[PDB]
Design a protein around this nucleic acid. Structure first.
Lengths: 187, 119, 338, 100, 45
RNA sequence: AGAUCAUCGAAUAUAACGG
RNA sequence: UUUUUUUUUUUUUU
RNA sequence: UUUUAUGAUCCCAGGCUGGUUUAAUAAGUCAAAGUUUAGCCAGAGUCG
RNA sequence: GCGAGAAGGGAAGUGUGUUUCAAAG
RNA sequence: AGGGAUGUUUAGCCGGGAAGUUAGCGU
């Protein structure tokens, strides 16, 4: 059965609807554009169903309860959550996205799609983000971070690192790139 | 030049005095009695402009025919009630404005309504 | 008071001969004090599809009511050819007609000031206003509700095929700060339409938006004729190469451009050109950029990209202009898919 | 027979013809040219674009009763669509189909 | 005003061969929240 | 946009507006 | 006027 | 003032069309008042 | 991001359809 | 004398969205 609908933190109480959509009794193949994404092999809607209201008994309440965001796994920690614990709010640092452990790329119903090449039978140039201005609306998962986006070349070391690039000035300080997953930096 | 401005409040007495909706028969006679339009305007003058202005169609005056007849009223007469359109307050205001200028431009050197002409 | 009429939609066979035109006026009314006419001429010496007639001194024409005007109009409407409009002229519109003729002659001359890179993100547009417009008339606007003293002699207006004032109006600004401020408050504004009888006319909703730009350079006319689908991009970071810098970073994004060009000038911003193979690829690119813009929080109104076009030109010793060519087949390159 | 409940035929959204016109400049046949858009309207999109949109209720036919008897168990009948803007309201709920 | 809202002429001529939406597509617009509504795009105001 | 026979059930007819 | 903002802008007086 | 046996008022039921060959001095040049099988047009709205 | 009533007989008689013409958003 | 001291609420317009509301004829 599908999970019950819940409102995210920072939102007033709303009135639940009686039916999922207008064509509830009559039609069945019609699907709403704002349908929930809970089946394995998908991603949330960011700010629609990612952070639902959290409740627990009085006994379970504690300081550590509030720090759940900052202890999330690597596969679910966003940029906002990552920059919150870093020195200087992660200012004057570098960040990049590692698209190697996505939920849909390992698990899901459509996890065996046919690509243009076929199957994978076997130093990169990944983008680097330099946060300049940081503004937190709804901590620790919400912020308007403005930074300079540039390109950088990876190294030959075992881990993913950035040797002597960024080199080229791509665009002036703009909005963030992605909000799914991010890595650390040299700083 | 220097056309007088018609106050909203003044029109309220005339509209309510002739009596929400009212028929157009009692309003045509009351307009001339008040003398707000000022030769003397005759009764036929207002009727002619009402049809020429295409006000029955614009206002959807023929929608009441389908309520009595139904399907028979859709067809033309030969292929039927003929009552006039009952203008409301809002509707009547517009008409008064339109007819007030149609008489001033009838003798002005520079036409306002229709200045153009086709050969 | 009456001061003359305004003809339009005249055939070419009557505007090119003053004898025939003068004869038609003598029979209807006064001959060519006698009345006077004024024929509009283009920069190349060609006539137009309209003319103007002026009445004699007001001393002999002040006492003229509608009774004498209806008969004159009617009688003078029959003599000319069919498909012709003969409207009256008021005291206010009479002075504006003279400016209309002068704009057509100076159309090419006026499209050089601020067109170059000097004034890039300045130019604006607002094709709301109808033929009723003037430099002076429009000057009062953008001052009582937006606070912006724009230049006077910086107003340009396009024209239709029948040398009629096109509704597309374009304005400029001295500074760049006020540019943004113009396209944020002029949304859904109803100042007025016409000033007749000391009262206002019909309503008209204003709508200002940046949708067109101008450029004049010596190294832009030739490059912009070879490809059929040419793109324009700007608002880039510090100075960059084409093959070594522009190509490499392009891989990150989704430009998908066959070729590229440069735009010198020695400013603090670059602008590289793009090329496509098919119209579908070009079209899809547009969407991509648009989407990306929002993500970056750049701005809706902020110029970021555009589509390059070649302006129509009229040469000499030509029987027919390129724009007036009916046998052109330059539409097959845009396939329709639905 | 007075004040009798009549019935009118149904009519959906008429698709506009490709070969339409904006404004007939002195037409010279005995009829009115069709329209491209027709019933449909063009509005500004959220993402700065132009797209079609279902207009205000297109002549909701109130003369014929609902076909499915089980309509009240899932939908609230006898609805009204009012247009208000600050302290101003207009009377346009009556959706009458005039004669041809 | 009432019949036709403020629609620029540039966007009307281009949108000629645009196919109208289907039955299900119409419900998407009508579904809440109406996030597809643009500037001055309200059907009530 | 113009034009474009009606038929069966046996049958039963003058009706609506203003002084 | 009150919650929501990955659709904006404005603030001076010799 | 308007319709009315060339059917005005008025009660129940039926949605309109095309489909190639087709014998006979009815030798059809379109199957001759009316017969169909892939098909055209067309068929309201609603989460308060 | 795009497509989706592709399973509809509930309404109507002078209507639904057919025929003759027209349509440079 | 520092394990001190200092710090504390920013303002207006317009457009779109959700919940509650869905009373008005005074323009």
């Amino acid at each position: 059965v599908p999970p019950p609908l819940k409102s995210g933190i920072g939102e007033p109480k709303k009135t639940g609807y009686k039916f999922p959509h207008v064509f509830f009794p009559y039609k069945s193949r019609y699907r709403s554009p704002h349908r929930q994404r809970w089946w394995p092999g998908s991603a949330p809607r960011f700010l629609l169903h990612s952070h639902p209201k959290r409740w627990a008994p009085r006994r379970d309440l504690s300081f550590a309860f509030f720090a759940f965001h900052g202890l999330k796994p690597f596969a679910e920690k966003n940029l906002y959550e990552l920059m919150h614990s870093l020195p200087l709010r992660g200012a004057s640092s570098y960040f990049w996205r590692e698209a190697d452990s996505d939920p849909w790329k390992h698990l899901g119903r459509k996890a065996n799609r046919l690509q243009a090449r076929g199957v994978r039978t076997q130093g990169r140039k990944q983008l680097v983000f330099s946060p300049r201005e940081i503004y937190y609306k709804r901590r620790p998962f919400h912020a308007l971070v403005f930074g300079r986006l540039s390109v950088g070349q990876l190294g030959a070391s075992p881990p993913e690192a950035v040797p002597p690039e960024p080199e080229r000035a791509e665009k002036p300080p703009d909005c963030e790139s992605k909000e799914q997953r991010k890595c650390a930096g040299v700083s | 030049s220097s056309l007088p401005r018609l106050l909203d409040s003044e029109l309220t007495a005339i509209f309510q005095g002739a009596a929400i909706t009212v028929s157009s028969n009692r309003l045509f006679k009351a307009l001339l009695q008040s003398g707000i339009l000022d030769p003397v305007v005759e009764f036929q003058k207002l009727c002619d402009l009402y049809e020429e202005g295409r006000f029955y169609r614009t206002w959807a005056g023929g929608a009441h025919i389908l309520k009595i007849s139904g399907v028979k009223g859709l067809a033309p007469p030969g292929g039927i009630d003929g009552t006039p359109k009952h203008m409301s307050y809002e509707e009547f205001r517009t008409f008064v404005h339109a007819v007030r200028v149609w008489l001033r431009d009838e003798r002005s050197p520079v036409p306002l309504c229709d200045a153009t002409v086709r050969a | 008071r009456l001061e003359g009429f305004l003809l339009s939609n005249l055939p070419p066979e009557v505007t090119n001969n003053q004898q025939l035109l003068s004869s038609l006026l003598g029979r209807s009314g006064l001959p060519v004090n006698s009345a006077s006419i004024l024929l509009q001429r283009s920069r190349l010496g060609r006539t137009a599809g309209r003319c103007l007639v002026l009445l004699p001194f007001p001393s002999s024409a002040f006492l003229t009511g509608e009774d004498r005007k209806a008969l004159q109009t009617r009688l003078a409407a029959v003599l000319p050819a069919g498909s012709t409009v003969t409207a009256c002229d008021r005291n206010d519109v009479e002075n504006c007609i003279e400016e209309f003729e002068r704009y057509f002659f100076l159309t090419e001359d006026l499209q050089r000031l601020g067109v170059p890179s000097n004034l890039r993100k300045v130019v604006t547009l607002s094709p709301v206003p109808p033929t009723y417009g003037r430099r002076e008339v429009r000057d009062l606007l953008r001052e009582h509700a937006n606070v912006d003293v724009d230049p006077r002699d910086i107003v340009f207006r396009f024209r239709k095929d029948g040398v009629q004032g096109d509704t597309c109006y374009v304005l400029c600004r001295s500074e760049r700060d006020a540019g943004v401020v113009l396209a944020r408050i002029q949304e859904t504004a109803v100042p007025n339409r016409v000033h007749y009888g000391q009262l206002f006319g019909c309503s008209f909703l204003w709508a200002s938006r940046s949708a067109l730009f101008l450029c004049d350079s010596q190294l832009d006319y030739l490059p912009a004729r070879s490809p059929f689908q040419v793109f324009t991009t700007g608002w880039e970071g510090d100075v960059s190469e084409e093959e070594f810098k522009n190509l490499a970073y392009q891989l990150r994004l989704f430009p998908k451009a066959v070729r590229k060009f440069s735009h010198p000038g020695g400013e603090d911003v670059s602008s590289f050109f793009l090329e496509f193979h098919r119209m579908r690829d070009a079209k899809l690119t547009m969407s991509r950029l648009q989407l990306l813009r929002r993500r970056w929080r750049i701005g809706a109104n902020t110029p970021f990209f555009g589509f390059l076009r070649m302006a129509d030109l009229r040469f000499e010793d030509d029987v027919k202009f390129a724009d007036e060519d009916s046998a052109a087949d330059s539409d097959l390159d845009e396939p329709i898919d639905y | 027979a007075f004040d009798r409940l009549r019935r009118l035929p149904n009519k959906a959204l008429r698709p506009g013809k490709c070969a339409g016109s904006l404004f007939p400049s002195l037409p010279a046949s005995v009829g009115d040219a069709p329209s491209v858009h027709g019933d449909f309207c063009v509005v500004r999109r959220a993402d700065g674009g132009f797209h079609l949109v279902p207009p205000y209720p297109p002549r909701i036919n109130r003369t014929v009763e609902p076909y499915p008897p089980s309509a009240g168990n899932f939908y609230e009948l006898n609805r009204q669509f009012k247009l208000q803007w600050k302290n101003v309201e207009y009377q346009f709920v009556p959706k009458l189909l005039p004669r041809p | 005003a009432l019949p036709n809202p403020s629609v620029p002429r540039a966007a009307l001529v281009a949108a000629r061969f645009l196919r109208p939406p289907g039955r299900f597509k119409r419900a998407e617009l009508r579904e809440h929240p109406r996030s597809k509504t643009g500037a001055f795009a309200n059907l009530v105001k």
